[PDB]
Enzyme design. Structure first.
Site, PDB file in Angstrom:
ATOM      1  N   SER A  61       2.213 -31.933 -32.006  1.00 45.44           N
ATOM      2  CA  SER A  61       1.602 -31.395 -33.208  1.00 45.44           C
ATOM      3  C   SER A  61       2.135 -31.867 -34.555  1.00 45.44           C
ATOM      4  CB  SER A  61       1.709 -29.852 -33.170  1.00 45.44           C
ATOM      5  OG  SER A  61       0.770 -29.421 -32.234  1.00 45.44           O
ATOM      6  N   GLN A 117      -6.607 -23.592 -28.354  1.00 43.52           N
ATOM      7  CA  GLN A 117      -7.018 -24.804 -27.664  1.00 43.52           C
ATOM      8  C   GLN A 117      -8.525 -24.987 -27.729  1.00 43.52           C
ATOM      9  OE1 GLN A 117      -4.952 -26.997 -26.405  1.00 43.52           O
ATOM     10  NE2 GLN A 117      -3.196 -25.688 -26.918  1.00 43.52           N
ATOM     11  N   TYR A 147      -2.673 -20.214 -35.854  1.00 46.01           N
ATOM     12  CA  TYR A 147      -2.494 -21.636 -35.574  1.00 46.01           C
ATOM     13  C   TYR A 147      -3.391 -22.065 -34.421  1.00 46.01           C
ATOM     14  CZ  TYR A 147       0.186 -25.958 -34.609  1.00 46.01           C
ATOM     15  OH  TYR A 147       0.576 -27.263 -34.408  1.00 46.01           O
ATOM     16  N   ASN A 149      -5.366 -25.737 -32.571  1.00 50.89           N
ATOM     17  CA  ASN A 149      -5.820 -27.120 -32.520  1.00 50.89           C
ATOM     18  C   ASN A 149      -7.318 -27.216 -32.775  1.00 50.89           C
ATOM     19  OD1 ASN A 149      -3.170 -28.201 -31.610  1.00 50.89           O
ATOM     20  ND2 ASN A 149      -3.642 -27.069 -29.737  1.00 50.89           N
ATOM     21  N   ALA A 315       5.006 -30.609 -29.877  1.00 48.73           N
ATOM     22  CA  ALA A 315       5.358 -30.709 -28.473  1.00 48.73           C
ATOM     23  C   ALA A 315       4.188 -31.178 -27.620  1.00 48.73           C
ATOM     24  CB  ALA A 315       5.885 -29.372 -27.913  1.00 48.73           C
ATOM     25  N   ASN A 340      10.426 -31.254 -23.658  1.00 50.24           N
ATOM     26  CA  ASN A 340       9.945 -30.149 -24.491  1.00 50.24           C
ATOM     27  C   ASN A 340      10.950 -29.008 -24.375  1.00 50.24           C
ATOM     28  OD1 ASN A 340       8.635 -28.081 -25.832  1.00 50.24           O
ATOM     29  ND2 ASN A 340       6.830 -28.041 -24.500  1.00 50.24           N
TER      30      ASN A 340
HETATM   31  C1  LIG Z   1       1.297 -29.226 -30.957  1.00 44.49           C
HETATM   32  O1  LIG Z   1       2.448 -29.431 -30.698  1.00 44.49           O
HETATM   33  C2  LIG Z   1       0.362 -28.733 -29.865  1.00 44.49           C
HETATM   34  C3  LIG Z   1       0.598 -29.184 -28.648  1.00 44.49           C
HETATM   35  N1  LIG Z   1      -0.202 -28.782 -27.496  1.00 44.49           N
HETATM   36  C4  LIG Z   1       0.451 -28.707 -26.185  1.00 44.49           C
HETATM   37  C5  LIG Z   1       0.592 -27.237 -25.811  1.00 44.49           C
HETATM   38  O2  LIG Z   1      -0.390 -26.450 -25.889  1.00 44.49           O
HETATM   39  O3  LIG Z   1       1.707 -26.794 -25.434  1.00 44.49           O
HETATM   40  C6  LIG Z   1      -0.336 -29.540 -25.166  1.00 44.49           C
HETATM   41  C7  LIG Z   1      -0.769 -30.854 -25.817  1.00 44.49           C
HETATM   42  C8  LIG Z   1      -1.515 -28.712 -24.654  1.00 44.49           C
HETATM   43  N2  LIG Z   1      -2.721 -29.473 -24.284  1.00 44.49           N
HETATM   44  C9  LIG Z   1      -3.962 -28.967 -24.323  1.00 44.49           C
HETATM   45  C10 LIG Z   1      -4.842 -30.014 -23.875  1.00 44.49           C
HETATM   46  N3  LIG Z   1      -4.056 -31.055 -23.596  1.00 44.49           N
HETATM   47  C11 LIG Z   1      -4.515 -32.350 -23.107  1.00 44.49           C
HETATM   48  N4  LIG Z   1      -2.796 -30.718 -23.835  1.00 44.49           N
HETATM   49  S1  LIG Z   1       0.750 -29.937 -23.774  1.00 44.49           S
HETATM   50  O4  LIG Z   1       1.260 -28.721 -23.144  1.00 44.49           O
HETATM   51  O5  LIG Z   1      -0.010 -30.543 -22.679  1.00 44.49           O
END
Ligand SMILES: *C(=O)/C=C/N[C@@H](C(=O)O)[C@](C)(Cn1cc[n+](C)n1)S(=O)O
Ligand SMILES: [Cl-]
Ligand SMILES: [Zn+2]
Ligand SMILES: [Zn+2]
Ligand SMILES: [Zn+2]
Length: 358
Positions: A61, A117, A147, A149, A315, A340
């Site tokens: 992130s 997500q 927060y 994504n 992360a 992580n």
């Molecule tokens: C910023 O650091 C956000 C990171 N997202 C992580 C998380 O949710 O812990 C990932 C990237 C989650 N994620 C959702 C979809 N994908 C492909 N990854 S990580 O755990 O995989």
């Protein structure tokens, strides 16, 4: 490097690595504007490939700071305005709940509860539209920060529409290339894959998996050298000769919302300096960082305050990253690890180092 830097880095980071079982780590300390580099351990355990200044790490992130600055650059070009409604850029978003949700709300996680997500079931433009069309807000826009994504991810995707460029092409030509970040990638080219460290989760080697709006929210990879240059660029935006990018960096550090002692920028988050270290340490725990909190608007947004602690955690499954800097002091740090490990441990170490060097 100065002995004072070498000493505090060893006494802070080597025990952190011992405490957290980190296989490989790169750190850049920016002191009086100049980066000093440190590496430990292995980018690939089984191959015994060491971490170097050319090793690529998953930023997670921390990617959102690039997205925020790219959005600021588009504002400075006049291509978008933060007050614009979302529907100006996506007319097919006809659902009524989107009436009143602006690009500002998307960029700052204040749209009213967009989820953390984007669902993994989303694999196409049509799937993405149905997701946003069906989302029901929990709060009125501009009242609560959650927060997500799916929030800033959509901001980035829409912010580049007036350019006619893909998000990746916009980022490469408008941010990476002008700043000479020549080893920073949304998609790692085959010729560079030899520098791509493995992340490690419960002992297994892992890389981040593709997902909708990943480039905007968590998908950038970079080296410790390029990330030090990113910090230098955000410490000293007037050094950047491209005026729209200089101004985009400044706009990403403007203060749009306040909750507690934290201010929300575009990607970046900020606090007044001197900071209460326990606040940034404790507040970085995901139990807090991901919780919904009421926000107060700052109207007009406060222009970038030099006496600020400016930072972002990030992360992936197998990586943990942190960036922090203090413009007034020309002081900063980048911490990239291929495990992580908990955010508070990252922030505590960063504050121990920067506090020792102020
Ligand atoms: C910023 O650091 C956000 C990171 N997202 C992580 C998380 O949710 O812990 C990932 C990237 C989650 N994620 C959702 C979809 N994908 C492909 N990854 S990580 O755990 O995989
Ligand atoms: Cl020691
Ligand atoms: Zn020691
Ligand atoms: Zn480079
Ligand atoms: Zn190269």
């Amino acid at each position: 490097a100065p002995q004072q830097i070498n000493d505090i880095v060893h006494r802070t980071i080597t025990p952190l690595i011992e405490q957290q079982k980190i296989p490989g780590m790169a750190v850049a300390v920016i002191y009086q504007g100049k980066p000093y580099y440190f590496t430990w351990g292995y980018a690939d355990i089984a191959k015994k490939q060491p971490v170097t200044q050319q090793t690529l790490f998953e930023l997670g992130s921390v990617s959102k700071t690039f997205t925020g600055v790219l959005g600021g650059d588009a504002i400075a070009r006049g291509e978008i305005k933060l007050s614009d409604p979302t529907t100006k850029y996506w007319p097919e978003l006809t659902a009524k709940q989107w009436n009143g949700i602006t690009l500002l709300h998307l960029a700052t996680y204040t749209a009213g509860g967009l989820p953390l997500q984007v669902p993994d079931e989303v694999k196409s433009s049509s799937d993405l539209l149905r997701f946003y069309q069906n989302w029901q807000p929990a709060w009125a826009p501009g009242t609560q920060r959650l927060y997500a994504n799916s929030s800033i991810g959509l901001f980035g995707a829409l912010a580049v529409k007036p350019s006619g460029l893909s998000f990746e092409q916009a980022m490469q030509t408008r941010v990476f290339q002008p700043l000479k970040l020549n080893h920073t990638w949304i998609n790692v080219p085959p010729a560079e894959e030899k520098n791509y460290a493995w992340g490690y989760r419960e002992g297994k080697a892992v890389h981040v998996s593709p997902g909708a709006l990943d480039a905007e929210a968590y998908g950038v990879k970079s080296t410790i050298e390029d990330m030090a240059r990113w910090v230098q660029s955000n410490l000293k935006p007037l050094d950047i000769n491209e005026k729209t990018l200089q101004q985009g960096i400044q706009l990403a550090q403007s203060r749009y919302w306040q909750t507690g002692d934290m201010y929300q920028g575009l990607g970046w988050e900020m606090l007044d300096w001197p900071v209460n270290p326990d606040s940034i340490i404790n507040g970085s725990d995901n139990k807090i960082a991901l919780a919904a909190r009421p926000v107060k608007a700052i109207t007009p947004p406060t222009p970038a305050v030099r006496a600020s602690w400016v930072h972002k955690t990030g992360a992936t499954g197998g990586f943990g990253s942190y960036v922090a800097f203090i413009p007034e002091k020309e002081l900063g740090i980048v911490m990239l690890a291929n495990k992580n490990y908990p955010n508070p441990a990252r922030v505590d170490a960063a504050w121990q180092i920067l506090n020792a060097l102020q």
